[PDB]
Each structure stands twice: as C-alpha cells, then as structure tokens.
Write a protein that binds this ligand. Structure first.
Ligand SMILES: Nc1ncnc2c1ncn2[C@@H]1O[C@H](COP(=O)(O)OP(=O)(O)NP(=O)(O)O)[C@@H](O)[C@H]1O
Ligand SMILES: Nc1ncnc2c1ncn2[C@@H]1O[C@H](COP(=O)(O)OP(=O)(O)NP(=O)(O)O)[C@@H](O)[C@H]1O
Ligand SMILES: [Mg+2]
Ligand SMILES: [Mg+2]
Lengths: 283, 292
C-alpha cells in the first residue's frame, strides 16, 4: 500500500554532517523512539526550497511514492519529517558510496563483484521501474554498500521534490533528451545507468575528465560516447553503448540489463580483464 | 684509427659506488691527470672474470674497438685501466639512466621527446652498426641522459669481454632476440630486437616487460608469437615499428637506419602518433554500434 511513516523532530537528532550535494545535505544522526531508551543510527538528508519561497509542511503523494518502496537493492526510506525544510531519513551505511569504494581498491576487487554489482544495481533499478519511480540522479556516488558484497541504489525521486532549476554536474549522467528537453523517463535512467557502470569498470573515473560541460552535449550529439574502460571485453562495453543509444526505445530495459550481467557473471574473467601487473602478451 | 688511451691507477680515484649490474660495478670517481692540480668527474666501471681464472692485464683488440668509438649519441669510452680486473672509464652523467627518468616523470614528458629519444637512440645504434660493434645489452637502463633533451647509448661491447656464462644472467634475456636465447647468436639484428623492447620500456613509461610472468615461459610464449602488448600512449604506428623489431626473421627486422627514419618523420607531428592522457581514465570514444 501507498504510505510513509512521519517523524517528529523530537525523535530525530543530528550528530555530525556527512556532506552536501546537488540539492540536499546528508547528516549522520540517531533516532530516539518514544521509548526514549536507546539511539538508532540513521542518515538524515535535508532538502530545502533554495529560494525560501515554498516550505515542506505538507506531505505530497510523491513523498508517499518514495516513502513506500522496498527492495533488497535500494536504500529504503525509513520516513519523512516535514517542516520548513524536508528531512528524509534512511539507514546509515558506514561503507560509504560504491564510487569512493572502487577508487580505494581498484582492480583488487573480484572481477566477480564488478559484475555482481552491475547485476544488483540493475535489479533495484528494475524494481523502481516496476512501481513507476523515476530516479533522475543515478550514479556511483549514488550507490551505497550494505554488505561488503551487497550494494543498494539510493537518492531516488529526490529531484521531483523540487521546482525545476537547470542552473546547478548531474548533466554528465543525463540522457541527452533530458538535457535538451527536461524529459526524464525510465529510459533516461538507463542512460544514467550506463555512465554508472562506466564509473565502475573505470574504477572511479570522472567522465569527460578534462572537457568543458557545454561541449558535453555537442560531442555526444555528434555520436561520441565515453571510451572503453581498460578492463572490459567488448561485450561488457557494448551494453553501456546501448544505454547511451540516442533512441530511448532502443536502450535496454533494466530487465535486459539484469539478464546480460547475470550470465556475464557466470564467467567473470571471460568478460573482465584486470591486469595482474603496463600491458603484455598480445598477438 | 683504432686505439684507446690507457690509464694508470694513480690517475683514477673512486669516490662512491653507483651500483652493480649483469657483469660489472660502476663507481663515481675523479681523474687526476699528471698535472695533479684538479680532479675531473668520471665514471669507473669494474669488470672481473668471476671465476678468478683469467685476468685483465693484457689489452685486446676488442677493447680497442670499444675504446675507439665516438658519436654524439653514445657514452664514449675515455679509456681503460688494465689489471687483475678491468676498469672502464667514461664521463659521469648525473642525469642517471633514461629509464629511471621516464618513471619519475611519466607522460609529463613532451610527446616530442618520447619520439626524439627514439630517434637519438637509433642514430647511436646505427653508428655502432657502421663500425661493426654489437651491443648485446641495449636497454633503457642502458641509455643515459646528457642534456635534459639529449640521450646517449651506453654499456656496449661489454659482454664480448667475458667468456660465455649463460647462468649469471639473473634479465637480461627479457631483451634478447629469440635466436640469441636459443643459440647464443648475437647480431646487429639481434640488437634491433633489443631496441624494440627498449622503446616499449620508453612509451610504457618504464614498465618491466613480462611483469608477472616466469623467465622460462618467456621463450615459449614468444616462440608462440606473443609479443609485448601495446603501450597505452602509442598509435598503432608507433607500436608497429616495435613489432617489426621482434619479427622472428632477423633479415626482416628494420635496420637502425630505417628505424631512425620512421621516428624522425613520426617526430614531425608528435600527438598524431602519441596520445598522452591529459586526464585519468579513457574518454571520448568513436561512437560504436551494436547489432540488435
Ligand atoms: N545511507 C547513507 N549512509 C552513509 N552515508 C550516506 C548515506 N546516504 C548518503 N550518504 C552520504 O551523504 C553524503 C552527502 O549527501 P549527497 O547530497 O547525497 O552527496 P552527493 O555525492 O552529492 N550525491 P547526489 O547529491 O545525490 O548527486 C555523500 O557523499 C553520501 O555517500
Ligand atoms: N656514465 C654514467 N653516469 C652516471 N651513472 C652511470 C653512468 N654509467 C652507468 N651508470 C650507473 O651505474 C649503475 C650500475 O652500473 P650497471 O651494471 O651498468 O647498471 P645496470 O642497471 O645493471 N645496466 P647493465 O648492468 O648494463 O644491465 C647504474 O644504475 C647506472 O645508471
Ligand atoms: Mg547522494
Ligand atoms: Mg648499465
């Protein structure tokens, strides 16, 4: 059913801040229930209407939409706490983002994971697709680790909580149609999904690293995608190229995406090649 | 003409040691001429007959061969100093080897140099070819920097100063043309092989060839036609010249003359043949295309 627990500011306490972002500031904090006994570790995201024009006193149906979703591979929303500014509350994952992870560990990661995370991310995303929830900010910074083996999609729907404002970058993940016509769809997420796997296999590389943001659309419009990561067979890189296929209706469903990476995960090294040691051995 | 200055141990003084190697130990030292005034910075290499069987009291014609060579892109031999152990004397180059260089600087180096050193190394080597001097140990550790722009081939001929001992090599087979590894057959074209592995060393910004492999597998895999892989900065043109160097057929491998020509014209448009990441990770691939 479509609901969401509401919190009282007397139950939520912020301890220290984790960081800000596109639109919002995440805090580490606890939650003391009406038992008043022990404190539960939680993560409090604070959203505001920048302009100080509208407030978050009323609960919308969209907050209920976010608030009611639950899947093994998402960071479920524990509840909201309305007020002049919105406070989203979720579980606290000390393992940080998946991006910060593939940077402080690189290829040392099992080639089995670097495919098991492609599968996991795809299921959560497929789940959201099922219940008609568009993400609008899928990325490796926006994937969190729960088990050292298990990830979870996070920070979804959060964009449709605010009035447009293409002045604030997430564009390096946006399907081109979203960049031209603010047209966000499940298939625009699929695009964003491709750039995330790139992020992954690239062991945490910033896309379009030395380019200028305004050139990002043009070059892309000209048919230039991100290059192939140095660990991917042309099979693991072909799935990404589909994600960025200009035609929305052509891009794979997360269902498809989930299938490929699941069977590709049956033979990890056959599709991923992580240097045991420069290059070597090439006829 | 074919000669070489002989030194007296009273003129040569060793100050501190730089390192050992395959067969020999290089020292930093000075040379006080019979003026006895000032001391000239020099580099003294010490060679011995390991087994303590033969000595280096007599000068051979080969020492004269090494001793008489002079080209802008070699480390000329200043002279020899015979004795129970041989002492080769050359200029001292504080800029160390070219290998230790492309490691402490990587791609920051001008793509213009990484081709200007391929040219320079090729000329020196061609020079040696002219005067019939085979090197037998060409490598990036064996190339030295004189100007921050100019390199010089070093440590040549030094192998033919010793009786064959193919177990003390413990490298340098990771540079040896395969025929030299099978049949101790060292030739100008075996050097060309060694030259290829050195450019690799270069563009690879100082990577140890066959990094995680086992030495005994090096010949087999190679015999099976597997060469070193392509460095991540080389167009398929700068990597094709290397593949020729390792072409099993000696008579097919490029002369250093050829090698000198390609790299000289390739040096006319540095980025057109070398691509050094201005940033981390790949980026901007040509728009690929799936199949249904
Ligand atoms: N459940 C969590 N447990 C621990 N840390 C979290 C959790 N959720 C978010 N964070 C961290 O909160 C920090 C700041 O919030 P956020 O605005 O999401 O960062 P961000 O990198 O900008 N992602 P985004 O703004 O969505 O593009 C991040 O660096 C997160 O990894
Ligand atoms: N002319 C020179 N000026 C400064 N350093 C030098 C000079 N010649 C040799 N060296 C250094 O001397 C050290 C030890 O001598 P050497 O045995 O030649 O080293 P190596 O790395 O083993 N080369 P090789 O033995 O020929 O395979 C090296 O690390 C050199 O860089
Ligand atoms: Mg986030
Ligand atoms: Mg040397």
């Amino acid at each position: 059913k479509v609901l969401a627990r509401i919190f009282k500011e007397t139950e939520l306490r912020k301890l220290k801040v984790l960081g800000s972002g596109v639109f919002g500031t995440v805090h580490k904090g606890v939650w003391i229930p009406e038992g008043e006994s022990i404190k539960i570790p939680v993560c409090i995201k604070v959203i505001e209407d920048k302009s100080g024009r509208q407030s978050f006193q009323a609960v919308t149906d969209h907050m209920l939409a976010i608030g009611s979703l639950d899947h093994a591979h998402i960071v479920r929303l524990l509840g909201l706490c309305p007020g002049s500014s919105l406070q989203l509350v979720t579980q606290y994952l000390p393992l940080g983002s998946l991006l910060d992870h593939v940077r402080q560990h690189r290829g040392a990661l099992g080639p089995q994971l670097l495919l098991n995370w492609g599968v996991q991310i795809a299921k959560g995303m497929y789940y959201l697709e099922e219940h008609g929830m568009v993400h609008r900010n899928l990325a490796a910074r926006n994937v969190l680790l729960k088990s050292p083996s298990q990830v979870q999609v996070a920070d979804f729907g959060v964009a449709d909580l605010l009035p447009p404002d293409d002045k604030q970058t997430p564009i390096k993940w946006m399907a081109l149609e979203s960049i031209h016509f603010g047209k966000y769809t499940h298939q625009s997420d699929v695009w964003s999904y491709g750039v995330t796997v790139w992020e992954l296999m690239t062991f945490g590389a910033e896309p379009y690293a030395g380019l200028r943001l305004a050139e990002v659309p043009d070059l892309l419009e000209k048919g230039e995608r991100l290059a192939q990561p140095q660990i991917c067979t042309i099979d693991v890189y072909m799935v990404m190229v589909k994600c960025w296929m200009i035609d929305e209706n052509i891009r794979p469903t997360f269902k498809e995406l989930a299938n490929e990476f699941t069977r590709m995960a049956r033979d990890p090294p056959r599709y991923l090649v992580i240097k045991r040691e420069g290059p070597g051995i090439a006829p």
